[PDB]
Design a protein around this ligand. Structure first.
Ligand code: ZN
Lengths: 290, 136, 32, 68, 151, 286
C-alpha cells in the first residue's frame, strides 16, 4: 500500500494565517505548532485549524512537543466545536526556504509513529510575499524501503510533479530523506468576502474633501516641480537625438528621467484634482439645505 | 491487425533498457499496448516477464489492463484467455491484477459488451476489494 | 461554388469576432 | 468516421485518455480511438478473397518506417 | 411523485416514538392529515423518530405546520441511529440534513427537498425540531410524510 | 474616551467565522461569543487574536446566560504562554445586532480587562459596511433626572493587517481582488460607496423616524436633539459667496488638470515619435 504522489494537503484560510502570524512573530525561532484536521482519504489531508506550541526557551530550532500543553489544548478545543485530531505539525523557516533539517526529521518521526500519514508543514514568513506564500508539506522517506531499490511513493498521476523542487530544498534532503506533498488551499465565498474588508475605506472617507489649503499648496508645489522638469525634458529630447543606441539606457542609469517624473507628476495631479472636483460636486447636491 | 502486425520490437527494447523509474516503467507498458493494440501479440510482455514483475500497486493494474488493449476485439474467447493470464485466487497483491483483469476485459469488448456485461455485472457485485471494484 | 465561398467567408468573420473578443479578455487578465 | 459521422468511441477514448493527467491507467482508453486503416474485400458469401488492390503512388510515400 | 410515492404504508407506526409529545395532541394527527395537528408540551423542542422496513428511499418531506408561528423553523434529520437518541444526541450531533424551514415550506401547499444522495438506504429516521417560527413554547405540526420509493 | 479606534485583524475575522461555523454546525445558534486578544498602542486598540469560549443564552429571558469564565482563564494562559504581548482586550459575538444582556456580559469581561471593548463581528457578508462594530461600556449620565445607566458607546472600527497577515490575505484574495483598476477609478468607486453608505445611514434614520411617528418607539429626545444639529449643519450651496468661491476653486483645479493633460498629450506624441522611429529603423535593416 504505497502512498500516492497525487496526495494533497488542504490548508484552510484560518490555518494559513495562524502559521504565518505565529511564524513571523517567532522570527527567527523555528516556532512550531500542531495542525488539526482530518485524513479524508488516502489522497487528501485537510488542515482545518492549527494552534501554536509555546517556546520552552531560547534557541533557533524546533523544541520537543509539550504533551501537557497539547493534550489539554486539544481537550479544551473540543469543548468549542473543534473535535479534530492532530494530522501533523507546522513550524517556521524564517527566510531560508521550506525544507526539513536533522532535528525536523526526528520531530516528524515522533508524529509518524503515532499517525503514519502525519504531515510536516514548513512555512517561510520572511520569503512569503503578497499573493505567494512560501509553504511546503513534507513526509519522511523510510530509509529501509528506498535503500533496497523502491521509490518512496507511487506515481499514478501528474499532480505531484507540477511544482519543481527548489535547489535549497534538494540540498537539505528533499527526495532523499523526505518528500514534498502538494499543498492546495480551501477557500470559500464567506471567508473570502470577509477578507475583502481589509483596507476597505469608510464611507465617510469617500465623500470627505481634502483640505483646500493643502490641496492648493500641493497643486502649487507639484506644478512648480514640472517647471524644472519641463526645462530638463527639453534637454533630454535634444540629447537623445545625437546619442548612440548603446547609451539609450546606460546613460539613463544614475540620472533622473524628466519624462518619467513628468508623467508621475501629471498622473498624481490628475487624480488629485479630478477626485477633489467630483467630491466637491457630489457634496453640493447631496448635502443641500433645500 | 494480427496479419499486418509489422510492429518494431527494437524500439520497445531500446526504451526498456533506459527505464530507471516506475513512471517510465509503466509508460513502456502503455506504450507496448499502444503498438500492439488489436494485434493480440504479447511478445514483449512474455520475453520481459521478470521486468514486467517490477510493476507494483497500480502499475500492476495498468500492466494487467494492457492485455485488454493488446487483445482488443478478441471476442471469440476472453474469459478463458484472461483466466489463462490470471489465476482465480491469489493472496499477495492480487487486487490490482484482479481489478486490472476486469478492466482489461472491458477493453477487449469496448463498445461491444453484448455478453460480457453479465459477467462484469456479477464480478462487480461479488467483489470486496476497492481496487477490484475500481477495475470492474 | 459562390455559396460555399459566401458561407466560408461568413464563418471566417464570425470566427474573427470570437478571436478578437478572447484577445480582449486575455489582455484584461494578463494585466492582473 | 470515413463518411463524416462523429465516431463516438474515438471521441470518448481521446477524452478519457487525456485524463491520464489524474489517473495513469485511464490512458488505455485511447485504444477506443484506434481506427484500423484497412480495405477489406468481401464476397456474396461474406468471405475475404485474394484481391490485390493497386495504389497509384510511390511505395515509399505511404509505407512503414524502415526498422533500425 | 414522478415515479415515487408517499410512504406511510411502509412506516410501521409501531416503532415511531415522538418524544416531547403532548397528551392533548399525539403523533397520530400529523401522519393522517384530516385536519388537527401534533404539538409539544414541555418545550418548543420536539424530537420525532420514524421506523419502517430497511429498503426505503427519501426524496422529500412535507413538514407543514400552522401559520401562527408554531410551525417548525429549524429541524434536524438523522438516519440509522443505533441505540436510543435523547434530545442532547439530537442537538450535539451532526445531522445528515439540517434544513432551516421558511414560511413558504410550512404552507400546506409546500414541499421541501432533501439531499437525496444522503438518503438511500434508511432503517429509521430521527427528526429533531429545534425551533419554530417564533417564540411559542409549544411547537405544532399540521402534517408530515416522506415522499420517495423503496430501495 | 479610553479607546479612540479599534483595529481588528483578518485573523480574528477568520477565527470568528470559523467559530460560528463549527458550533453552528452541531446546533443552531443565535450567536457565538469569544474573547478578543490584542495589544494597546496609544489610544488605538489592536485586536489581533481571539479564542472561543463556551456560551449559551435562553432566548426567552436575557437574564439566563452562561459564559465559561474558568475556560476563559484557562485559554488565556495558553495564549499568554505563546504570545505574552497579546492581552485580553474585550470580547466578541456574532449576533447581527446588540443584545440586551451584552452590558451584563461585559461586566464579566470587565474584570479581566477594565476597559473592555465589545466588537460585534457579523458573519453574514454585508455588502456595504464593515463586519465589525466596536463598543465600549460607559456611564451615560442623563440630564432628565433618570439614574445613570451602563450603555455601549460606539468606537470606530478598522480592519488592518500585520505584514505577514497581509501576505496571507493577498494569497487568499489573489484571484478575486482586481488590482488592475487605477487609483482614479478606485477613488470614484469609494465615492460611489460613500453615496451608498450615506444613503443607507439616512434610510436607517428615516425608518426610525417612521416608527416614532406611528408610535412603535417613543421619542428618545437625544436622537431628535442630534437630528436638529444634522439638518442645521446642512450648508446652503445657493449663497453667492459660496458659489463664487466654489467657482473660483473649481477653476483653480481645472487649469492644473489642463496643464497636466497638456503635458500628457505631448509626452504621448513623443512616445509615438519613438515608436515610428523604432518601426522605421527596424524595417530598414530588414
Ligand atoms: Zn526546521
Amino acid at each position: 500500500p504505497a502512498v500516492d504522489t497525487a496526495e494533497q494537503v488542504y490548508i484552510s484560510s484560518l490555518a494559513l494565517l495562524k502559521m504565518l502570524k505565529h511564524g513571523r512573530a517567532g522570527v527567527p525561532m523555528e516556532v512550531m505548532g500542531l495542525m488539526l484536521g482530518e485524513f479524508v482519504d488516502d489522497y487528501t489531508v485537510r488542515v482545518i485549524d492549527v494552534f501554536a506550541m509555546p517556546q520552552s526557551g531560547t534557541g533557533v530550532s524546533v523544541e520537543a512537543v509539550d504533551p501537557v500543553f497539547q493534550a489539554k489544548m486539544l481537550d479544551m478545543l473540543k469543548q468549542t466545536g473543534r473535535p479534530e485530531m492532530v494530522v501533523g505539525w507546522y513550524h517556521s523557516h524564517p527566510g531560508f526556504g521550506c525544507w526539513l533539517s536533522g532535528v525536523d526529521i526526528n520531530t516528524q518521526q515522533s508524529f509518524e509513529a503515532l499517525s503514519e500519514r502525519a504531515v510536516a508543514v514548513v512555512v517561510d514568513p520572511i520569503q512569503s510575499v503578497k499573493g505567494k506564500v512560501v509553504i511546503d508539506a513534507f513526509r519522511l522517506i523510510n530509509a529501509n524501503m528506498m535503500v533496497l531499490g523502491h521509490e518512496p511513493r507511487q506515481t499514478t498521476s501528474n499532480l505531484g510533479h507540477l511544482n519543481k523542487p527548489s535547489i535549497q530544498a534538494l540540498i537539505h534532503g528533499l527526495n532523499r530523506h523526505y518528500y514534498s506533498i502538494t499543498i492546495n488551499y480551501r477557500k470559500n465565498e464567506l471567508e473570502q468576502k470577509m477578507l475583502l474588508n481589509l483596507h476597505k475605506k469608510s464611507w465617510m472617507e469617500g465623500l470627505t474633501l481634502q483640505d483646500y489649503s493643502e490641496h492648493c499648496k500641493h497643486n502649487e508645489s507639484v506644478v512648480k516641480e514640472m517647471l524644472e522638469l519641463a526645462k530638463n525634458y527639453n534637454k533630454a529630447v535634444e540629447e537623445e537625438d545625437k546619442m548612440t543606441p548603446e547609451q539609450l539606457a546606460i546613460k539613463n542609469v544614475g540620472k533622473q528621467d524628466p519624462k518619467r517624473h513628468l508623467e508621475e507628476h501629471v498622473d498624481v495631479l490628475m487624480t488629485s484634482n479630478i477626485v477633489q472636483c467630483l467630491a466637491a460636486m457630489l457634496d453640493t447636491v447631496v448635502f443641500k439645505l433645500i | 491487425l494480427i496479419r499486418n502486425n509489422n510492429t518494431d520490437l527494437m524500439i520497445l527494447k531500446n526504451t526498456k533498457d533506459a527505464v530507471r523509474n516506475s513512471v517510465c516503467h509503466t509508460a513502456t507498458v502503455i506504450a507496448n499496448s499502444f503498438m500492439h493494440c488489436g494485434t493480440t501479440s504479447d511478445q514483449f510482455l512474455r520475453d520481459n516477464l521478470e521486468w514486467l514483475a517490477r510493476a507494483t500497486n497500480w502499475a500492476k493494474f495498468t500492466a494487467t489492463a494492457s492485455l485488454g488493449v493488446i487483445h482488443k476485439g478478441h471476442e471469440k474467447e476472453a474469459l478463458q484467455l484472461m483466466a489463462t493470464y490470471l489465476p482465480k485466487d491469489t493472496s499477495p497483491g492480487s487486487a490490482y491484477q484482479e481489478g486490472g483483469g476486469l478492466y482489461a476485459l472491458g477493453l477487449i469488448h469496448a463498445n461491444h459488451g453484448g455478453d460480457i456485461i453479465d459477467y462484469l455485472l456479477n464480478q462487480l457485485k461479488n467483489a470486496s476489494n476497492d481496487i477490484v471494484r475500481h477495475g470492474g | 461554388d459562390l455559396y460555399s465561398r459566401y458561407k466560408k467567408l461568413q464563418q471566417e468573420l464570425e470566427f474573427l469576432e470570437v478571436q478578437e473578443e478572447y484577445i480582449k479578455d486575455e489582455q484584461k487578465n494578463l494585466k492582473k | 468516421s470515413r463518411t463524416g459521422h462523429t465516431h463516438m468511441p474515438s471521441v470518448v477514448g481521446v477524452l478519457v485518455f487525456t485524463q491520464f493527467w489524474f489517473w495513469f491507467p485511464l490512458s488505455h482508453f485511447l485504444s477506443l480511438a484506434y481506427t484500423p486503416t484497412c480495405v477489406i474485400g468481401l464476397n456474396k458469401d461474406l468471405k475475404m478473397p485474394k484481391v490485390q488492390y493497386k495504389s497509384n503512388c510511390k511505395p515509399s510515400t505511404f509505407a512503414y518506417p524502415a526498422p533500425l | 411523485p414522478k415515479g415515487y410515492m408517499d410512504l406511510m404504508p411502509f412506516i410501521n407506526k409501531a416503532g415511531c416514538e415522538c418524544l416531547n409529545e403532548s397528551d392533548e395532541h399525539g403523533f397520530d394527527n400529523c401522519l393522517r392529515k384530516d385536519t388537527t395537528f401534533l404539538e409539544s408540551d414541555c418545550d418548543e423542542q420536539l424530537l420525532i423518530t420514524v421506523a419502517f422496513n430497511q429498503p426505503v428511499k427519501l426524496y422529500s418531506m412535507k413538514f407543514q405546520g400552522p401559520d401562527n408561528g408554531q410551525g417548525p423553523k429549524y429541524v434536524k434529520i438523522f438516519i440509522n441511529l443505533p441505540r436510543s437518541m435523547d434530545f442532547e444526541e439530537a442537538e450535539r450531533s451532526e445531522p445528515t440534513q439540517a434544513l432551516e424551514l421558511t414560511e413558504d415550506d410550512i404552507k400546506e401547499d409546500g414541499i421541501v427537498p432533501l439531499r437525496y444522495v444522503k438518503f438511500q438506504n434508511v432503517n429509521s429516521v430521527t427528526i429533531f425540531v429545534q425551533s419554530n417560527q417564533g417564540e411559542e413554547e409549544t411547537t405544532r405540526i399540521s402534517y408530515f410524510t416522506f415522499i420517495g420509493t423503496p430501495v | 474616551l479610553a479607546v479612540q479606534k479599534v483595529v481588528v485583524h483578518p485573523l480574528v475575522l477568520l477565527s470568528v467565522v470559523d467559530h460560528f461555523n463549527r458550533i453552528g454546525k452541531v446546533g443552531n445558534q443565535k450567536r457565538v461569543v469569544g474573547v478578543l486578544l490584542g495589544s494597546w498602542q496609544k489610544k488605538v486598540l489592536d485586536v489581533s487574536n481571539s479564542f472561543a469560549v463556551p456560551f449559551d443564552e435562553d432566548d426567552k429571558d436575557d437574564s439566563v446566560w452562561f459564559l465559561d469564565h474558568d475556560y476563559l482563564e484557562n485559554m488565556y494562559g495558553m495564549f499568554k504562554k505563546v504570545n505574552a504581548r497579546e492581552r485580553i482586550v474585550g470580547w466578541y459575538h456574532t449576533g447581527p445586532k446588540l443584545h440586551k444582556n451584552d452590558i451584563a456580559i461585559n461586566e464579566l469581561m470587565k474584570r479581566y480587562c477594565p476597559n473592555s471593548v465589545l466588537v460585534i463581528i457579523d458573519v453574514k457578508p454585508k455588502d456595504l459596511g464593515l463586519p465589525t462594530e466596536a463598543y465600549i461600556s460607559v456611564e451615560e449620565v442623563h440630564d432628565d433626572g433618570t439614574p445613570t445607566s451602563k450603555t455601549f458607546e460606539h468606537v470606530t472600527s478598522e480592519i488592518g493587517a500585520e505584514e505577514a497577515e497581509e501576505v496571507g490575505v493577498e494569497h487568499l484574495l489573489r484571484d478575486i481582488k482586481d488590482t488592475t483598476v487605477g487609483t482614479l477609478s478606485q477613488r470614484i468607486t469609494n465615492q460611489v460607496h460613500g453615496l451608498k453608505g450615506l444613503n443607507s445611514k439616512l434610510l436607517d434614520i428615516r425608518s426610525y423616524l417612521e416608527k416614532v411617528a406611528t408610535g412603535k418607539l417613543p421619542i428618545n429626545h437625544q436622537i431628535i436633539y442630534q437630528l436638529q444639529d444634522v439638518f442645521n449643519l446642512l450648508p446652503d450651496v445657493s449663497l453667492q459667496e459660496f458659489v463664487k468661491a466654489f467657482y473660483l476653486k473649481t477653476n483653480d483645479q481645472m487649469v492644473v488638470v489642463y496643464l497636466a493633460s497638456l503635458i500628457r498629450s505631448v509626452v504621448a506624441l513623443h512616445n509615438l515619435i519613438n515608436n515610428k522611429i523604432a518601426n522605421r529603423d527596424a524595417e530598414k535593416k530588414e
